[PDB]
Symmetry: D2
Subunit: 323 residues, 4 copies
């Protein structure tokens, strides 16, 4: 997985969802009066409306990522072997990872509010059900001001400011930031010949400033390439050019089927790619097999409802036959 | 630019067109009775039908790439500083680079026929017009059997067999093939710990087999990554899954706006990406700002016409609004 | 700096000392009755004998590295910006970095004894003198069983087990170990063509298993290359062959004059390279301008003395003129 | 193998000899009146004196490398699979590779003279003897003005000017020079943060300008690292300091035993390293298990003799026991 934020007049938030198998992903709008029952903290009978992509395997919104009607985004990304969930601890707000996106997005309008809510968080090892055990995750949260990373590991709970608005998988966020130090020299412009003034070295290609940028599908490499591509991106401000650039950034680090074998020719690939406009409450997405951008606008629904609104995903290529 | 061939059940050919500006790109079908007048060789009054993307600046099909009705594809890719075009040479078929795609695709049904035709070729330095001087190019040709590369350089004209079905920009094709030797170790699977059996190294990410793959936008790096991604692609045999995979291969080496500065913030970027089905005569394309695949089917036209059939390219985002 | 341990039959310990200027580096034997006065802990009037290279100040053995007569080695390596030394803390053994090598090597026969001693350590910010402020350092300690790394940073004091027996400069040791995970594929043997079974890739060179190994002079790169070179080294048990291999490992990551400019053509270079036999108490060294190995054997001195025994370093080329 | 030139005040020439097994390598001075009998060209009964290292299994000087009394150096380096030797060709100077160093160094005082002599050369496939078939080689020649590379391949005989004064093994020299283009950015100084002006990236190590420099033992990697290390080496004030720097350049790309397995634990390693002072006719050398520099001075011999003067190499560690 790769999650990013991007600014181009509006502020966008979204992710590549990378896994082996598609589990009936749907776009789900949770309206304001859909009751959230939490196992160990107080219920939210009335809360902010949410739109995101969820696993369509329950009548509870099991979100992989989502934004709320106040412009706050949150995404859970695989963090296998690094994530550690805890026992219920007295004095803490004990929240299960499966409840965590509803818990935050339900009641926070900004990342600063999320920071205050997270001060007493303890992420607890309680499964949604026996049939559906917890995934090992870490989280990116973002609004129009800033983004943060939340990591619950064996040593504890850390909330990091994210100066680049990017997150992938393992290892911890502090290693990911540190590793960018190694790429300081990379550039969008042709470098000078610093190697030796005694010989002539030919600029035989454009793009030589970026040589050294890693192009493989591993977690650290995608973090570096997504960061360089996001930070150096240029768009145009209009919505369509803006989301175009966003999906180009995500394309840069997507995983193609066949290239990442996780054992026995079982391939990890980018099942979908999302781009959310935080100001307008629009969830846009592509899928591996549908290149066309599909848009679901949360504000076109009756957000005073109390039942989940589900949009099944367009998963076949939608071709414009021009003749 | 990056050009590739790919086989699933059908055979596909296409390219990323990477440059600073659009020369009014259009999809042009050249029907059979559109007369080709050649400056220094014999005319083709009747020939194979062709479909490709061209610069729409004249009532000649100035193709960047195309396929013909017999399943032969050809593409010209930037080769700046390496390309050399010649004086008229007696006893040769003297063909200008601007005429070259029409010359080959007009009269050859296969790459083997193209190989025979190319034995007598001399590419001459004749401009289409004063307003349109020649670009420095090299060419990939492909059919369902094989692909070749044509390069006219200062040392002469070389025709290479292309064992990977990929081409980018500079340098010469022999260096490009040779450089793949350096990447023999790359894998789709997790490597064994060969570094030392004395220590335990953790597989902290999937995709570690590919570490070493270059991710920058330079010509050689894109050649290596496109080759690795193409050769290790899997898809099912269906048309939509096949072209999905094809566009994913091209996405892997596309150039995002902002990332390749050739100047004072003059950006090289992937203006369009094409995929042609050689068996069906369908030209499919995406553009930088339209993620939806658009399809133009040469066989839906009256190929006995004698004038160019020109379709505008759909260049703005075609979004499916789901609510 | 790079410090390593290496086993043949005997156990060896040593380092490259990398800096801009050579001062009065000398080989100094501290005999058992040389009284160690400590600024905040109890004095050691009688202790283990030590041999190492020091800065050549009459009043005290200011060691860069050393071993003791019981086969325990310790080295201080530059750790600029990462090292943090503390205020005196009650209930701790408050030891200055300049006292640290004498403090450990004076009273510990093994790394296990050092581990117990270090449980109470607080490294305090007390200069040897006003004219000679503390350097920012971290430490490698080794005996014939194991090695550890000691790091005092802003977060606190950490003692790590060192599974590879290597240390360089910044960042923290945990990041250095983690980064080795990225090099699991590297091999002494020619890799298989894993890139694609569809094409023939030529083994045009020996040594291709190691491609990916970094060759620059930076701290992390030297850590990776020293580790790979040390762990894959082979040598016979005989002393001359063993220290030969050791100096070859150190040569692999040495810094050549001209290549590492730390500002206005001020060059960091490997001033000396040491190899200590822990079992035999011999300090062997080469210097940048003397390739011949020099040996100083601590057991040839009167270790019951109470005064420092100082040997100048042989700093100019000792050439065998053979004809 | 790696061969280099380096200038300090004097001009130096030398090489690492990398192979699996040491035979009877000897330092051999060929005096002026040792008759050179050539199988297919005119004999040189009187010629320039030569000193180099040879295979001491024959009464003829079978040099791996050498310099002559007029300051011209020549070295043969493994070129396996690339070297091609020819049939005797009428009108050419037909010289066997085993005769080639004597042929050039016998009669040329400069590289310019060698260039004229090489205009008619045809390197022929004639073994010295049945017990000793020809090795596949290419050659570096150097004097105080310049250096060249000689490569006889299937396509023919090519003499290149060598702008960097380095040579390794495969592939052809043109590819080796071209590949340097990929390293234009590398520097001896800390790079600017070109990655992004939006974030602060920490200079946590010196030597970061060189990141990207390859550190493995393959032929291309050693070519790049030797070139960068040689070109950015300082010059020095004395003979001793100068050859110290020279051996440091060679050390940078030496092959350590255990790291390069060409077989079933058959290790390629740097058996000897040479440094020749072209002005003084001194052959200096350091073997793998003798770190001390040994010097053999051609001018201390009677160069009017007619028989080879052969010195065994000092192959065991010469240690300075200082106490």
């Amino acid at each position: 997985c790769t999650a990013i934020t991007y600014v181009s007049k509006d502020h966008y938030f979204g992710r590549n969802f990378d896994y082996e198998i598609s589990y009936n992903e749907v776009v789900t709008i949770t309206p304001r009066n859909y009751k959230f029952s939490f196992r160990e903290v107080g219920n939210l009978d009335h809360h902010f409306a949410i739109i995101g992509i969820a696993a369509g395997i329950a009548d509870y919104p099991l979100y992989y990522d989502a934004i709320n009607e106040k412009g706050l985004g949150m995404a859970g990304l695989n963090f296998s072997g690094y994530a550690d969930y805890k026992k219920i601890e007295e004095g803490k707000e004990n929240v299960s990872p499966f409840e965590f996106i509803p818990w935050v997005l339900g009641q926070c309008s900004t990342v600063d509010e999320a920071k205050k809510l997270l001060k007493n968080l303890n992420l607890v090892n309680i499964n949604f059900s026996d049939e559906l055990p917890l995934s090992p995750l870490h989280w990116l949260l973002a609004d129009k001001e800033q983004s943060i990373v939340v990591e619950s590991t064996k040593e504890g709970l850390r909330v990091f400011d994210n100066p680049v608005g990017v997150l992938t998988n393992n290892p911890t966020f502090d290693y990911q930031l540190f590793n960018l130090n190694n790429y300081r020299v990379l550039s969008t412009r042709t470098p000078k010949n610093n190697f030796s003034d005694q010989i002539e070295l030919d600029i035989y290609s454009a793009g030589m400033g970026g040589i050294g940028l890693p192009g493989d599908l591993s977690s650290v490499s995608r973090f570096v390439k997504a960061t360089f591509t996001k930070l150096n991106s240029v768009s145009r401000s209009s919505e369509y050019e803006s989301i175009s650039q966003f999906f180009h950034i995500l394309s840069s680090v997507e995983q193609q089927k066949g290239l990442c074998d996780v054992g026995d020719e079982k391939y990890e690939y980018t099942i979908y790619s999302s781009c959310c406009n935080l100001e307008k409450g629009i969830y846009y997405y592509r899928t591996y097999d549908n290149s066309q951008i599909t848009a679901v606008d949360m504000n076109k629904e009756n957000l005073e409802k109390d039942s989940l609104i589900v949009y099944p995903m367009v998963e076949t290529q939608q071709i414009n036959y021009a003749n």
